[PDB]
Chains A and B, each alone.
Chain A
């Protein structure tokens, strides 16, 4: 079992800034996928293969890292982007980090 842990838990920011979210895998050498989910909608794919973005995704999201460490940096936070973000390897999911308005 590959357990993914997500670092920031709850993260409180104001709109306009940038935010970094960190996850640390259990084994290294695999890609990462990042999802977002608002309050009461279907989730959507933000990043697959740990660096590329999905369709209908602006370039303010970018994710990077390697080995066991992975980052998702979102630039210029808006009000609607405050949502819970889920990390995802092969079958395993993180518990998720929450972005909250300040």
Chain B
């Protein structure tokens, strides 16, 4: 199986910075990309970014550069090499960004692309 667990919901102040964790378990973490998407009410979905956790190469959306930042932390352990953590340090928090934030992972079939996000995190709502 594959699990994506997040951190709990938070209430922050305008101009502060949130830091959302995303722990992935149940697969070889160093292979598959992790995407981050958000859900704003009354505006539909909106993509944020992705991160390849082998090295850590990222890519952000064009309208969110200079605000978001993504890191990862691998499992340097030859006994449980499966688990891993992704992070998002979303800075420049304005009152428009009250939303729910999901960290997703693509499917594992061969004809699955990258954007057919199969496995989903529970989502974390932030309110500012």
Direct contact of A and B (CB under 8 A): yes
Chain A interface residues toward B at CB < 8 A: 31, 33, 42-45, 48-49, 52, 54-55, 86, 88-91, 93-96
Residues of chain A contacted by B61 (CB below 8 angstroms): 91
* Chain B contacts with A in 27-59, Cβ cutoff 8 A: 44-47
Instruction: Indicate if B113 sits at the interface (CB-CB under 8 A).
Output: yes
Interface of A is mostly: loop
Number of A-B contacts (CB under 8 A): 44
Give chain B nearest CB distance to A17 CB in angstroms: 27
Residues of chain A contacted by B112 (CB below 8 angstroms): 48-49
User: Cβ of A94 and Cβ of B44 under 8 Å apart?
Assistant: yes
Give chain A nearest CB distance to B32 CB in angstroms: 15
Given the known inter-chain contacts A49-B111, A96-B44, please indicate yes or no for A33 contacting B102, CB distance below 8 A: no
Cα distance A52–B111 when bound, in Å?
Answer: 10
User: Cβ of A48 and Cβ of B113 under 8 Å apart?
Assistant: yes
**Residues of B within 8 A of A (CB-CB), count:** 18
B 92-128 binary contact with A (CB < 8 Å = 1; else 0): 0000000000100001000111011110111100000
Residues of chain A contacted by B113 (CB below 8 angstroms): 31, 48-49
Residues of chain A contacted by B45 (CB below 8 angstroms): 86, 88, 93
User: Cβ of A43 and Cβ of B120 under 8 Å apart?
Assistant: yes
Residues of chain A contacted by B111 (CB below 8 angstroms): 49, 52
User: Cβ of A48 and Cβ of B44 under 8 Å apart?
Assistant: no
User: Cβ of A95 and Cβ of B47 under 8 Å apart?
Assistant: no
Closest to A31 in B: B113
